[PDB]
Design a protein around this ligand. Structure first.
Ligand SMILES: O=C(CO)[C@@H](O)[C@H](O)[C@H](O)CO
Ligand SMILES: [Co+2]
Length: 290
């Protein structure tokens, strides 16, 4: 059956924060998974990586990692120095993941994010470098039983993989057993003709699903077709990870990277965000036919 998570960034204005409080929180909320930022792991002291692994084991919580590579670590760059620096950086992230007991890394691990359209790009050249880089990283990942999740993003955030057709073509070309597609309701809602059809199309390639409303509020506060999404997951016999990715806070690096320029929380306290996420999880489980 499916396992449910949340991204810690629901509560935070920064990517690089302590994650321990969120392991205890997701256990209290009856979630199966905490997704953490790779940027909070890569330079974390060894003792704190071990403490995070032990706390997750104590609470029987699965940890996953999210990443959007910065421009200086663009593994799709036509600049060999940038490409190599990005590969060095993701290998360090994977080393830290291993110490924290983390096996899944998803997001823009295959290019840079958020994309900057102020300068030119070469989509074919970037795609070719991206595939070569991801194959090298997939091979490195095997020693730690790590899976790479290639996220399909809207046109404003990236240019390489904007729909399930492009992401499936890319992942089939990469041709590595530990490289899979990640779909995201926010992104699918912009680029797909029909969200449930995109999930069915992706099928066996779907390694993880991010969920949120169209404006990234918690599920139940918007208009997403939750029953149709649930049916599509049944149609492909999905028993994988469903991670809530709500972004309702303006400010900090998180608000600037997600481009949220107004409060969507009604100035909610942390306690109110907890209550709304619990309500949302019950709503999602009901819509998905749990
Ligand atoms: O959907 C998004 C970005 O719009 C997130 O899942 C992001 O890609 C991940 O946090 C890695 O940065
Ligand atoms: Co996402």
């Amino acid at each position: 059956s499916m396992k449910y998570g949340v991204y810690f960034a629901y509560w935070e204005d920064s990517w690089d924060v302590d994650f321990e409080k969120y392991v205890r929180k997701v256990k209290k909320l009856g979630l199966d998974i905490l997704e953490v930022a790779a940027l909070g792991l890569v330079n974390l002291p060894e003792q704190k990586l071990e403490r995070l692994k032990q706390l997750a084991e104590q609470h029987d919580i699965i940890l996953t990692a999210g990443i959007g590579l910065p421009k200086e670590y663009d593994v799709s760059s036509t600049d060999k120095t940038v490409r190599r620096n990005g590969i060095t950086f993701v290998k360090k992230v994977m080393d830290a993941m291993h110490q924290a007991g983390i096996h899944r890394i998803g997001g823009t691990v295959y290019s840079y994010w958020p994309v900057d359209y102020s300068g030119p790009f070469d989509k074919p050249a970037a795609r070719k470098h991206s595939i070569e880089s991801v194959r090298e990283l997939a091979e490195y990942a095997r020693q730690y039983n790590i899976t790479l999740l290639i996220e399909t993003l809207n046109r404003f955030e990236q240019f390489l993989l904007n729909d399930a057709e492009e992401a499936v073509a890319y992942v089939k070309e990469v041709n590595k057993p530990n490289v899979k597609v990640m779909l995201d309701t926010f992104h699918m809602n912009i680029e797909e003709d029909h969200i449930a059809d995109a999930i069915r199309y992706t099928g066996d390639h779907l390694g993880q699903l991010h969920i949120g409303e169209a404006n990234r509020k918690v599920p139940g506060k918007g208009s997403m077709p939750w029953t149709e999404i649930g049916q599509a997951l049944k149609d492909i016999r999905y028993d994988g990870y469903v991670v809530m990715e709500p972004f309702v806070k303006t400010g900090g690096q998180v608000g600037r990277d997600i481009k949220l320029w107004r409060d969507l929380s009604g100035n909610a306290t942390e306690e109110q965000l907890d209550r709304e996420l619990a309500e949302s999880l019950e709503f999602v489980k009901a819509a998905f036919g749990e």
